[PDB]
Design a protein around this nucleic acid. Structure first.
Lengths: 61, 205, 82, 80, 85
RNA sequence: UGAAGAGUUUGAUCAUGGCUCAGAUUGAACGCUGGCGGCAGGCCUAACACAUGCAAGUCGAACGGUAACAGGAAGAAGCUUGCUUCUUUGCUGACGAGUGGCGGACGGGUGAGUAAUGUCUGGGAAACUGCCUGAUGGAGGGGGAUAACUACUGGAAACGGUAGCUAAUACCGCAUAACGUCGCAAGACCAAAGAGGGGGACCUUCGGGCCUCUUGCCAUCGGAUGUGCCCAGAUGGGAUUAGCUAGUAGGUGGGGUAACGGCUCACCUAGGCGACGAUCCCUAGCUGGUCUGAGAGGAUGACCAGCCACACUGGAACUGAGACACGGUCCAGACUCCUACGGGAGGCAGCAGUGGGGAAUAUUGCACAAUGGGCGCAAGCCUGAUGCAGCCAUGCCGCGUGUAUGAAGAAGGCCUUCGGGUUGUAAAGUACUUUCAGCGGGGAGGAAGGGAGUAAAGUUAAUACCUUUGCUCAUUGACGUUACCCGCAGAAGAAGCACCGGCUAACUCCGUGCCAGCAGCCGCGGUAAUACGGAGGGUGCAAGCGUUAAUCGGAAUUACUGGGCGUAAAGCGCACGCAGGCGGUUUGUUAAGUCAGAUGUGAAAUCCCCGGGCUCAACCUGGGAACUGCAUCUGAUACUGGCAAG
RNA sequence: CUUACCACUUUGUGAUUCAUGACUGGGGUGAAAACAAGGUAACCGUAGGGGAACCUGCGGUUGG
């Protein structure tokens, strides 16, 4: 069981993702953490601080 | 990588004057010293035990212009040498060619000193050295290359240098612009208020 | 067979050589019997490009150790400089 | 006279050969206590000159059989 | 694969054929000495030994067998012959 | 040269005690960002399967040769005065195939297996050892082959078969024969090969003999090197594995081996190992080292070096100095490929590379210039070793991305108690500079050597030839348009990422409203919320920065150093008792522990100290120290042990 | 040609695992009043009754 962190979502019922350690104080059994931007996951939208942790690329400004 | 930001706001966080904006205009008339450099500058700066160790380490770095990786290496070497680590570290910082060019007058600020060193316009024992962290030893001869003895900025830096106190441990000539690192400065003749023990406590854990 | 040959050490494009007594079947700078001096090719005014300590070379040649050509050239140079 | 381990017979039932245990008093590597360690060791006596409990000197020789490379030197205490 | 391996294989077959012939002949003579020992004869076995011996020494000369092996056959066979006395 | 703590159980306390955090590290990975260089590192997973190329040859100074190239000598011609066309000639330089020699047992890969005869440390005795080296001696005289070749000749092919031919440093006799082997001795027995250069004189059956030098060949004995073998100690976990073992343990003989040996066999004996962990199961290449730690320890064994083991899987041998053989053999499998369906071929754990697995790991590069290695007298040839180059912020290290001053203290942004404040000397503008990137120009060092010509009566046919030295000449760099130096403009081409409640350096406004979200922990969010998103500001680090994983630390949280058991977890319900651990007192002795001295060993690298070279640093390197161990000898004798006597 | 050994191979017999299997075992899901003085201290072993968790017997403890 993995946690899709961040402010938004795109994952589906077969998509291929990458996961990393770290549990959430959620219901017992969640200890993995989907990597946003790594495979089928995407960086959250209109994110502008702690961007590298959500896979969102630098806005051209 | 150097530090390329505003010079005075770096001094205002440290509180004291750092000699990194040097010349005629005598800061606090340059610009608004003694408020930490931001929107909450007026806010009280009372800070913890780890904050004062950090503040002085930061201040020493900002004076010499050394980054945290080299400063950590300086500390490692100083703590490896024989003797007290704090004055070991200040001596390593003051044997830097950057610094020595500054302290010998030619070179207005340590960043202008570094501008000179980097730009192939200083000779240590008669050959061009352009590394700022190059260590000068007792009895090198730091000198401006001939091609750059006609530079107006080095000549201008020289005058505003005897108003600055001239270090005892090194002896310089302004006519034939050239100097001589005599000895490693002691802690005492390093005219400063650096409290090196909080620095050695910072990296000692 | 025992040969006195150069083991290439040092850094890249700054060769340093150990003069090593070795069984000829080993790798160039692998298992050796004895170190007998060194050779620094990139040292021009740089001092002491070659130390050999020729008593041990004499001992090992008296036992049928062959010399590489480069070590032989180095021995001539050391003898001439003397 | 080369090493002459000095031990005590523990079984004399192989013909022309005894088994000899050697006590060493070694210091424990981590706990620092001096413990006793044993080394049983098949030895060759040609003449069956040894009995259990005897205290015997042995020396090392060429391998006489599988697991037999020590030979008897003396009997120091023909203990009965 | 390699051409020196190709030659070295057929050279080994030729060497092996030569060697098998030679060491079979050596064993023939050695076994004739033996065959005489368990017949219990001293003259027959001494003759067999004295015609075995040049064969074993020459084959240890050319490296078919080691000298130690030659010294072995001769030692064993003389011990047997002399207890046979 | 060496040691830090904080948070969380309560209404509060103090203990206990776990959890979590602050550090260092990495063969990393991922996310965002990315200038230059130096130096290093780069399939950790599938010992998965592998297309293609390359990774081992070389020697004509062993040999028959002479396909092929180029020459000579010709011949026959065209007839240029002999200019070039065909045939022949190994006559020659040379050289494909073949014989023979040496190499292919190295170098290179990998880490499957292996829990201990593998490794490490330290010893040992019963062995062999190509090439190299020392010494001594020999090196006489014959033979029969056979590859190639020629002619047939089957097979799709791979691969063959038949008849004839031919050499040798191939092979086989014979002689000769210790310093060798067997033997107590007498005795007996055991070997070889030439080739090359030059040549006075002489001879020549005009081939050469003869002479001389060089090199090789045989034997024996040493050296050196390498390898085999033995022993002890050490080197994971499991007792929810307690018995294991019939070449099992020993002994006598045979045999075998280079050698000792149950190595093997026949007989005999009936042992051997095990609670100081046998056996069995599981896991694992081992070490120098590495990381972490004040240390003691823990964790590791990538790179580099040493040792082991493996080479599709399982067997086996041969050949050989050496192999039970990575690019050798055969036979058994399993795959793949070919096939004319008879039958064949193959093994990237070499380099590069492909697919595949995977979170993840690079070029199907250049060169043999250097250092090595193989062969060769050599010239040289070969060498995916190696030297380099490519790729990749993977690490480390250095340097850039400007410098000085500049208050209209500008606009603009943000906060405003609307006074301002802040961004902030920041920018702009003024001067200044030009590292590095770009362009031009110079230009080291890695190159020693080898080639040709030059004396010693060197050596002796004295000049030869060859050797050493003699100089002299010309020549050898993959990297490479090198490092570096010089000029050229022009600030010109060159900043990001995390964080800001506490731990923890750094706060405000907006938005949102127990939603959305955050989170390492404490926890935060129900109208503010310095904790969530944006901003503005600030902090930290910076060509990087965060996250994840993982190891040690913190953790005295397995406590040897360095903890506990009344109630926090923890004294067996109670005895008795074997093994085991421990042992009152005084002599004597011994000298095992212990201590001391010595010696030998503890590879190099690494680590540490002092230096040296790279413009500095990293990196490289010299010397040292260290390797805290192991063994041996000598000594001491308080203490512990032994032995004796009390 | 034939012995001796042997890898593999075939058989049987064994051990050991791997998966899955009704079942497990039903974890379920859906369907048929008193806080040591306080509806009857706090426990320990054991045995009974029953869907149990409780209650009761027998011994024991103060940690009432």
């Amino acid at each position: 069981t993995s946690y899709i962190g961040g402010e938004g979502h795109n994952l589906q019922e077969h998509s291929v993702i990458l996961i990393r350690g770290g549990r959430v104080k959620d219901l017992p059994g969640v200890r993995y953490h989907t990597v946003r931007g790594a495979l089928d996951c995407s960086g959250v939208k209109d994110r502008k601080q702690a961007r590298s942790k959500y896979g969102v690329k630098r806005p051209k400004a | 990588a150097r530090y390329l930001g505003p010079k005075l706001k770096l001094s205002r966080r440290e509180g004291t004057d750092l000699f990194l904006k040097s010349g005629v205009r005598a800061i606090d008339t340059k610009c608004k010293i003694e408020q930490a450099p931001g929107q909450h500058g007026a806010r009280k700066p009372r800070l913890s035990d780890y904050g004062v160790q950090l503040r002085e380490k930061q201040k020493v770095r900002r004076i010499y212009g050394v980054l945290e990786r080299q400063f950590r290496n300086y500390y490692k070497e100083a703590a490896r040498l024989k003797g007290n680590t704090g004055e070991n570290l200040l001596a390593l910082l003051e044997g830097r060619l950057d610094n020595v060019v500054y302290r010998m007058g030619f070179g207005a600020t340590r960043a202008e000193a570094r501008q000179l060193v980097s730009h192939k316009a200083i000779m240590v024992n008669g050959r061009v050295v352009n590394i700022a962290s190059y260590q000068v030893s007792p009895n090198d001869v730091v000198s401006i290359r001939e091609k750059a003895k006609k530079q107006s900025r080095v000549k201008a830096a020289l005058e505003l240098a005897e108003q600055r106190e001239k270090p005892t441990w090194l002896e310089v000539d302004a006519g034939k612009m050239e100097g001589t690192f005599k000895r490693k400065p002691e802690r005492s003749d390093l005219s400063a208020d650096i409290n090196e023990h909080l620095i050695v406590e910072l990296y000692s854990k | 067979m025992v040969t006195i040959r150069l083991a290439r050490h040092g850094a890249k494009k700054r060769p340093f050589y150990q003069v090593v007594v070795a069984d000829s079947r080993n790798a160039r700078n692998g298992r050796f019997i004895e170190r007998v001096g060194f050779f620094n090719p990139i040292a021009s005014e740089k001092e002491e490009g070659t130390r050999l300590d020729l008593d041990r070379i004499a001992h090992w040649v008296g036992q049928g150790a062959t010399i590489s050509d480069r070590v032989a050239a180095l021995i001539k140079e050391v003898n001439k400089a003397a | 006279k080369i090493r002459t381990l000095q031990g005590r017979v523990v079984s004399d039932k192989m013909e022309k050969s005894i088994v000899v245990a050697i006590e060493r008093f070694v210091k424990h590597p981590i706990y620092g206590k001096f413990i006793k360690r044993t080394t049983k060791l098949h030895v060759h006596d040609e003449n069956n000159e040894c009995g259990i409990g005897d205290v015997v000197e042995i020396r090392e020789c060429r391998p006489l059989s599988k697991t037999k490379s020590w030979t008897l030197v003396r009997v120091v205490e023909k203990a009965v | 694969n390699i051409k020196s391996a190709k030659k070295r294989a057929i050279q080994s077959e030729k060497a092996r054929k030569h060697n098998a012939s030679r060491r079979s002949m050596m064993r023939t003579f050695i076994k004739k000495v033996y065959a005489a020992i368990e017949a219990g004869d001293k003259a027959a076995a001494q003759k067999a030994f004295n015609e075995m011996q040049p064969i074993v020494d020459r084959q240890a000369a050319k490296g078919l067998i080691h000298k130690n092996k030659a010294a072995r056959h001769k030692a064993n066979l003389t011990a047997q012959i002399n207890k046979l006395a």
